[PDB]
Design a protein around this ligand. Structure first.
Ligand SMILES: [Cl-]
Ligand SMILES: [Cl-]
Ligand SMILES: [Cl-]
Ligand SMILES: [Cl-]
Ligand SMILES: [Cl-]
Ligand SMILES: [Cl-]
Ligand SMILES: [Cl-]
Ligand SMILES: [Cl-]
Ligand SMILES: [Cl-]
Ligand SMILES: [Cl-]
Ligand code: NA
Ligand code: NA
Ligand code: NA
Ligand code: NA
Ligand code: NA
Ligand code: NA
Ligand code: NA
Ligand code: NA
Lengths: 105, 105
């Protein structure tokens, strides 16, 4: 019911990235699912704007949207890609691919 | 149509904060409105997970949600609050209250 990290396996061929990513075929990216509603959790680490916007959304549900549960910290992965010369080069830290922590923003 | 910053005036008495915030009565908090869909904008600064999740949402619209346009940088404001001794104390930098930049996360 609340903002938390859940599993998401992403296949590179389904997102159109298998044309430049040789390996791996799939990877655990995770996704941040849940709702930002009161009472909040102890580890959602909400900003004061996300708390204010959620309160305004309660008073005006048609004019203002609630806060979103988005990843607050990302972890890199390693991909085997083909460079301009068609050889498999290793990108050891491809940053911003997996979710480490979620939160209400 | 795309992730951008828009105006949001928040009244402290409508969110139940006028009991500990004497002044100001209202403040410009801003809100991040728009959609994270391709083709993206030049200044939404999207993370690679937000791009991947948006691509997975296109292939599986019922199983995975799209990325959210949330504030990426917050600016503080100044509030006049009553401390435990009932006097108006000034909190010069009340951080995390106004939106500075939006983005797709
Ligand atoms: Cl709470
Ligand atoms: Cl925070
Ligand atoms: Cl690297
Ligand atoms: Cl290393
Ligand atoms: Cl990178
Ligand atoms: Cl694009
Ligand atoms: Cl970024
Ligand atoms: Cl201060
Ligand atoms: Cl200062
Ligand atoms: Cl503060
Ligand atoms: Na904050
Ligand atoms: Na309303
Ligand atoms: Na709305
Ligand atoms: Na290492
Ligand atoms: Na990134
Ligand atoms: Na689907
Ligand atoms: Na869904
Ligand atoms: Na100053």
């Amino acid at each position: 019911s609340h903002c938390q990290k859940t599993s998401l396996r992403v296949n590179f061929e389904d997102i159109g990235w298998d044309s430049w990513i040789i390996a791996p075929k799939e990877y655990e990216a995770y996704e941040c699912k849940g709702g930002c509603f009161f009472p909040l959790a102890d580890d959602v680490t909400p900003t004061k704007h996300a708390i204010v916007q959620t309160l305004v959304h309660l008073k005006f549900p048609t004019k203002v949207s609630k806060a979103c549960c988005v990843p607050t910290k990302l972890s890199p992965i390693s991909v085997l890609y083909k460079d301009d010369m068609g050889v498999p080069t290793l990108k050891y830290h491809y940053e911003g691919m997996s979710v480490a922590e979620c939160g209400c923003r």
